Structure formats: C-alpha cells, structure tokens
Amino acid sequence: MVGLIWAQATSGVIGRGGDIPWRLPEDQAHFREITMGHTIVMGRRTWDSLPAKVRPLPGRRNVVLSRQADFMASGAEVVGSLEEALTSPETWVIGGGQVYALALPYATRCEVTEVDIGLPREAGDALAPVLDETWRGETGEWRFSRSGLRYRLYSYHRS
Numbered sequence: 001m002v003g004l005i006w007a008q009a010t011s012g013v014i015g016r017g018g019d020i021p022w023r024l025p026e027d028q029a030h031f032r033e034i035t036m037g038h039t040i041v042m043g044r045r046t047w048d049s050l051p052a053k054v055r056p057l058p059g060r061r062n063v064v065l066s067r068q069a070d071f072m073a074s075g076a077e078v079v080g081s082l083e084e085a086l087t088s089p090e091t092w093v094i095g096g097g098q099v100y101a102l103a104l105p106y107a108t109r110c111e112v113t114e115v116d117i118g119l120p121r122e123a124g125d126a127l128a129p130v131l132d133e134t135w136r137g138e139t140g141e142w143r144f145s146r147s148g149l150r151y152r153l154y155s156y157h158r159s
C-alpha cells in the first residue's frame with residue numbers, strides 16, 4: 001500500500017519559494033495521525049524544508065529520495081531510486097511536487113486537505129497531482145482554521 005498525503009490550495013498550489021504558502025496548524029495532527037508508525041517517503045527538497053526540530057519526523061522511518069549518492073540526512077534513509085523507497089507495506093509519500101508525481105502510479109490512497117485560499121498557480125510553484133477517474137473519493141465538511149482559512153479533507157481510494 002502506497003499512499004500520498006498533501007495539503008493544497010483549491011488552485012493546486014502546494015508550495016512556493018521552498019515553503020507552504022499558508023498556515024494551517026490543524027493539519028499537523030491529521031498528518032501525524034495518518035503517517036505515525038509508518039515509513040514516510042519524501043523528495044530531497046521536502047526534507048530540507050522540514051524545520052530542524054522535526055527533521056527527521058519522530059516515530060516514522062524517514063526515507064529521502066535524492067540523485068546525490070552522498071547526500072547527508074541524519075536520522076533518515078537516503079535512496080536514489082523510487083523503487084528503493086517503496087519497499088514497506090505501508091508507505092506514505094509526503095512530498096514534494098516531484099515525488100508526488102513520481103509516486104502517484106504506485107498509490108492506492110490519497111489523503112488530501114483542500115485549503116480555501118485564493119492563490120493562483122504561478123510559474124515554478126510545487127503543484128499537487130491531479131486525480132483522474134480511477135479514484136473514488138469521500139469529501140469531508142468545510143472547517144474554519146484559527147488562521148481564518150476554510151479547509152476540508154478528502155479520502156481517495158483505488159484498488
């Protein structure tokens with residue numbers, strides 16, 4: 001089982017300038033709940049964007065994809081191919097744009113948080129993968145964040 005987990009602006013933007021273009025702390029707990037105790041796979045830039053205090057993410061086997069066969073990532077496993085990254089039965093791909101695209105074909109689950117923020121796609125942005133009709137989804141109710149942003153959760157599956 002390979003799952004993808006991400007948060008996106010309605011527009012599809014998931015990252016800009018090396019960061020996430022919004023604040024939504026309420027998301028942190030759902031992320032933690034889905035990923036805890038499993039192997040998590042991320043691209044090298046996502047690793048670098050993780051704050052030093054939670055790098056590596058505690059309670060998870062952190063796997064980092066990189067084409068630098070010498071890249072240093074303390075507390076994480078550096079692999080150079082996607083096949084090497086996906087050996088665990090329950091693996092959650094947590095980013096970024098490149099890695100989500102690369103892993104989508106292997107995925108049977110996606111936990112998506114939609115953020116109701118006006119943020120048009122700009123050139124160079126990290127973007128969320130587009131789910132076609134092989135996916136059957138379940139949409140949650142909109143909620144308000146203390147940040148002021150409305151957000152909801154989607155759970156997608158495909159056998």
Ligand SMILES: NC(=O)C1=CN([C@@H]2O[C@H](COP(=O)(O)OP(=O)(O)OC[C@H]3O[C@@H](n4cnc5c(N)ncnc54)[C@H](OP(=O)(O)O)[C@@H]3O)[C@@H](O)[C@H]2O)C=CC1
Nearest residue numbers: 006007015018019043044045046066067095096097098099
């Ligand atoms: N909103 C959300 O839910 C999330 C948003 N993000 C955002 O995403 C952005 C980063 O995304 P993005 O720029 O797409 O980067 P990625 O995190 O996907 O990392 C890309 C890097 O992964 C490595 N890589 C990619 N493909 C391969 C491959 N096929 N084989 C080996 N190594 C590979 C390379 O490392 P190297 O260059 O070292 O070879 C490459 O530079 C940031 O802005 C981040 O904040 C991240 C996670 C979640």
